[PDB]
Write a protein that holds these residues in place. Sequence first.
Motif, PDB file in Angstrom:
ATOM      1  N   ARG A  62      17.425   8.394  16.631  1.00 12.29           N
ATOM      2  CA  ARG A  62      18.441   8.339  16.151  1.00 12.29           C
ATOM      3  C   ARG A  62      19.486   7.091  17.386  1.00 12.29           C
ATOM      4  O   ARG A  62      19.036   8.020  18.343  1.00 12.29           O
ATOM      5  N   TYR A 114      13.437   2.268  14.024  1.00  8.49           N
ATOM      6  CA  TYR A 114      12.468   2.479  14.621  1.00  8.49           C
ATOM      7  C   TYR A 114      12.101   2.519  16.181  1.00  8.49           C
ATOM      8  O   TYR A 114      12.879   1.201  17.099  1.00  8.49           O
ATOM      9  N   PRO A 125      24.878   8.893   8.691  1.00  9.26           N
ATOM     10  CA  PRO A 125      25.514   9.197   9.695  1.00  9.26           C
ATOM     11  C   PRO A 125      24.846  10.957   9.293  1.00  9.26           C
ATOM     12  O   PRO A 125      25.076  11.175   8.806  1.00  9.26           O
ATOM     13  N   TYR A 126      24.813  11.472  10.504  1.00 10.42           N
ATOM     14  CA  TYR A 126      23.633  12.373  11.322  1.00 10.42           C
ATOM     15  C   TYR A 126      23.264  13.673  10.018  1.00 10.42           C
ATOM     16  O   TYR A 126      22.251  14.078  10.632  1.00 10.42           O
ATOM     17  N   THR A 183       5.831   6.397   8.965  1.00  5.73           N
ATOM     18  CA  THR A 183       5.322   5.281   9.578  1.00  5.73           C
ATOM     19  C   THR A 183       5.426   4.489  10.584  1.00  5.73           C
ATOM     20  O   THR A 183       4.620   4.329  11.290  1.00  5.73           O
ATOM     21  N   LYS A 219       0.043   8.345  -1.435  1.00  4.21           N
ATOM     22  CA  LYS A 219       0.633   6.569  -1.294  1.00  4.21           C
ATOM     23  C   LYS A 219       1.985   6.523  -1.621  1.00  4.21           C
ATOM     24  O   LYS A 219       2.596   5.353  -1.328  1.00  4.21           O
ATOM     25  N   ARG A 220       2.898   7.560  -1.094  1.00  7.39           N
ATOM     26  CA  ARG A 220       3.954   7.854  -1.446  1.00  7.39           C
ATOM     27  C   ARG A 220       5.187   7.122  -0.239  1.00  7.39           C
ATOM     28  O   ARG A 220       3.775   7.333   0.298  1.00  7.39           O
ATOM     29  N   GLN A 221       5.849   7.234   0.208  1.00  5.36           N
ATOM     30  CA  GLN A 221       6.921   7.324   1.270  1.00  5.36           C
ATOM     31  C   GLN A 221       5.867   7.820   3.062  1.00  5.36           C
ATOM     32  O   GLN A 221       5.917   9.105   2.184  1.00  5.36           O
ATOM     33  N   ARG A 222       6.221   7.505   3.962  1.00  3.18           N
ATOM     34  CA  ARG A 222       5.721   7.909   4.886  1.00  3.18           C
ATOM     35  C   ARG A 222       6.162   7.579   6.413  1.00  3.18           C
ATOM     36  O   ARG A 222       6.704   6.775   6.129  1.00  3.18           O
ATOM     37  N   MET A 257      11.235   6.933  14.834  1.00  5.76           N
ATOM     38  CA  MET A 257      12.930   6.779  14.210  1.00  5.76           C
ATOM     39  C   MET A 257      13.768   7.509  15.005  1.00  5.76           C
ATOM     40  O   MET A 257      14.110   8.772  14.684  1.00  5.76           O
ATOM     41  N   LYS A 304      25.073   5.960  17.828  1.00  5.68           N
ATOM     42  CA  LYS A 304      25.703   6.183  16.218  1.00  5.68           C
ATOM     43  C   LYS A 304      24.969   6.947  15.270  1.00  5.68           C
ATOM     44  O   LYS A 304      25.670   7.606  14.636  1.00  5.68           O
ATOM     45  N   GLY A 305      24.109   8.015  15.910  1.00  8.81           N
ATOM     46  CA  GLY A 305      23.168   8.958  15.025  1.00  8.81           C
ATOM     47  C   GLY A 305      22.386   8.646  13.807  1.00  8.81           C
ATOM     48  O   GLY A 305      22.371   9.857  13.824  1.00  8.81           O
ATOM     49  N   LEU A 306      22.775   7.227  14.481  1.00 11.71           N
ATOM     50  CA  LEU A 306      21.513   6.747  12.403  1.00 11.71           C
ATOM     51  C   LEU A 306      20.451   6.771  13.304  1.00 11.71           C
ATOM     52  O   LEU A 306      19.690   5.836  14.637  1.00 11.71           O
ATOM     53  N   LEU A 307      19.021   6.815  13.070  1.00 11.80           N
ATOM     54  CA  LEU A 307      18.029   6.655  13.786  1.00 11.80           C
ATOM     55  C   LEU A 307      17.379   5.338  12.985  1.00 11.80           C
ATOM     56  O   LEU A 307      17.389   4.879  12.551  1.00 11.80           O
ATOM     57  N   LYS A 323       0.844  -0.811  -0.275  1.00  7.22           N
ATOM     58  CA  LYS A 323      -0.138   0.077  -0.179  1.00  7.22           C
ATOM     59  C   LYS A 323       1.177   1.434  -0.454  1.00  7.22           C
ATOM     60  O   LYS A 323       1.840   1.962  -0.524  1.00  7.22           O
ATOM     61  N   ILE A 324       0.962   1.424   1.651  1.00  7.40           N
ATOM     62  CA  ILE A 324       1.476   3.242   1.588  1.00  7.40           C
ATOM     63  C   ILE A 324       2.711   3.476   0.842  1.00  7.40           C
ATOM     64  O   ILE A 324       3.288   4.225   0.684  1.00  7.40           O
ATOM     65  N   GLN A 325       3.817   2.283   1.329  1.00  5.06           N
ATOM     66  CA  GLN A 325       5.219   2.046   1.002  1.00  5.06           C
ATOM     67  C   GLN A 325       5.578   2.822   2.015  1.00  5.06           C
ATOM     68  O   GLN A 325       6.373   4.450   1.654  1.00  5.06           O
ATOM     69  N   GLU A 326       5.931   2.447   2.853  1.00  2.00           N
ATOM     70  CA  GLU A 326       6.464   2.936   4.769  1.00  2.00           C
ATOM     71  C   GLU A 326       8.069   4.127   3.946  1.00  2.00           C
ATOM     72  O   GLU A 326       8.534   3.457   3.255  1.00  2.00           O
ATOM     73  N   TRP A 327       8.093   4.904   4.772  1.00  2.00           N
ATOM     74  CA  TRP A 327       9.336   5.952   4.340  1.00  2.00           C
ATOM     75  C   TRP A 327      10.785   5.578   4.199  1.00  2.00           C
ATOM     76  O   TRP A 327      10.707   4.792   5.052  1.00  2.00           O
TER      77      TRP A 327
END
Lengths: 71, 229
Positions: free
Chosen positions: B50, B58, A70-71, B45, B40-43, B48, B53-56, A60-64
Amino acid sequence: FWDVDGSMVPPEWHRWLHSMTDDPPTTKPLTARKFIWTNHKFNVTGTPEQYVPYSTTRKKIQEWIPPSTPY
Amino acid sequence: SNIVVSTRTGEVMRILPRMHEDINEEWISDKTRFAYDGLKRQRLTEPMVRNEKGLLTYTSWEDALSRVAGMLQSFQGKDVAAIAGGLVDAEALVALKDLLNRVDSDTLCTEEVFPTAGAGTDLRSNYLLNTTIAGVEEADVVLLVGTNPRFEAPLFNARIRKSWLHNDLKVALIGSPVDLTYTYDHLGDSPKILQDIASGSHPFSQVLKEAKKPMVVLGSSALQRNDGA
């Protein structure tokens, strides 16, 4: 044998036992189109062969997309 | 513009305009009309946060929300701000400013800036298109300044050309000769024109005196203009 049942019959002869047709398929063999099955696998509810209903039409939505940087 | 939306099975199948004479009169923007697909494109969801490591990654709400709860108790009043969006609902602004009330955080920044000589926020009428799009048709003369109406309000542009096909009145662009569908007088640029008209010396402004039921449009993009004040 000692496990015989229905579905063992082929579809043409399947029409013949039910006497939808006076004439056995012998005399009038059917269209034999390319995509129809040949071995006739009969009903198979048990055993590893087994129909599985499942979700169809993808997504459906295609999650982001998360960032990989990094950063 | 008002809308009747044909959703199905929890999916938005298509958008249709909902007619209203004060606004769309059943002719919504072609850009809005196919906008739904973008939902309908990216959302966003999942949350997230960080990591080290500074990375996000879930995250459950308890995590991120307890964390921002750990930040926003620290910097009450000053040293905090809130970037309002262009599509954002007024309610979230209400609750968020109320949050900034409890901590007395006066900051309330919003996307486009709007100049306020004598503080124009108070009168509310200042930024309002005080005449309705329905009210444009009764005008016997109309003027525009800056941005062409169609790239902000295509509906309203259609209202203009409709009046041009009916009500018969002058319109002319200022600052650019952008390709509008209807005839408009060419004019140069602001520093001269605005004063020549403010003086009334400008012949076009003489036409402005000549005709009753004036209307004076401004492209809101020109409200910025650094020295758009």
